Amino acid sequence: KLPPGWEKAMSRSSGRVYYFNHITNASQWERPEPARVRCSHLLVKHSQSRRPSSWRQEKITRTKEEALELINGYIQKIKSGEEDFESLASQFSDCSSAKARGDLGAFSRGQMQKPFEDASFALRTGEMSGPVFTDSGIHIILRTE
């Protein structure tokens, strides 16, 4: 009955049923392929990233755990409406796509790191991922088309 990738869960703090996607790491309260997709992302690197450097910081020394805390904060702020995805990507994404509000443009299967690709294609149009881990760092992914 659930579509692929989705499972039922209950909140630990409230008991309320929600649904979680183990490909995109998205979670939502409601019960829930193209040749190409277009996405934007926000990348937070850490000391084990393949290249631990960006436009923001020449040497990135934060731990994978500190990177995840930052990603989770940004997700909260985006979900609350307190900040826009695009604004946070432009400020805080450790990737030159920050200068395009995080836009990567359109892409096919075969082109990106696999966890990124699978999350991207498993998102609905307009849906945002949870934290997505790759050799580059931890991503928030927004599917725009």
Side-chain angles (χ1 to χ4, degrees):
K1 209 143 128 58
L2 285 176
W6 291 94
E7 72 193 87
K8 282 216 308 148
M10 322 177 113
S11 165
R12 294 276 165 91
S13 56
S14 86
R16 182 146 76 98
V17 171
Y18 68 100
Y19 300 77
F20 165 69
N21 187 301
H22 69 263
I23 304 160
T24 65
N25 286 326
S27 44
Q28 61 181 59
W29 291 118
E30 302 189 43
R31 195 171 174 93
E33 96 185 350
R36 279 143 72 79
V37 295
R38 185 186 188 171
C39 296
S40 297
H41 79 145
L42 190 165
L43 174 62
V44 178
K45 283 186 173 186
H46 47 78
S47 66
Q48 300 195 7
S49 298
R50 184 219 325 101
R51 308 184 157 196
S53 192
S54 72
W55 78 269
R56 300 194 69 224
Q57 198 171 12
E58 189 165 14
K59 189 186 201 179
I60 293 178
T61 60
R62 76 174 64 90
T63 65
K64 170 181 338 197
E65 302 75 13
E66 286 173 323
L68 180 55
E69 287 252 66
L70 282 162
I71 284 283
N72 283 334
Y74 299 143
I75 291 170
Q76 292 181 308
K77 292 172 214 101
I78 296 162
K79 287 192 164 192
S80 75
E82 286 164 60
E83 276 283 11
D84 289 336
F85 174 97
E86 293 87 343
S87 171
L88 296 179
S90 299
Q91 297 175 256
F92 303 118
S93 185
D94 282 316
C95 190
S96 60
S97 55
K99 301 303 168 218
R101 300 168 97 212
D103 184 41
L104 298 172
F107 60 87
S108 288
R109 287 208 179 260
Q111 307 184 229
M112 298 271 178
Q113 290 172 134
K114 187 70 174 146
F116 190 101
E117 170 187 312
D118 286 346
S120 293
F121 281 86
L123 289 167
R124 295 173 306 255
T125 293
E127 189 187 4
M128 191 175 70
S129 79
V132 171
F133 290 85
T134 72
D135 292 346
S136 314
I138 303 171
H139 307 252
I140 304 165
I141 305 175
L142 175 66
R143 178 173 174 204
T144 57
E145 305 175 359

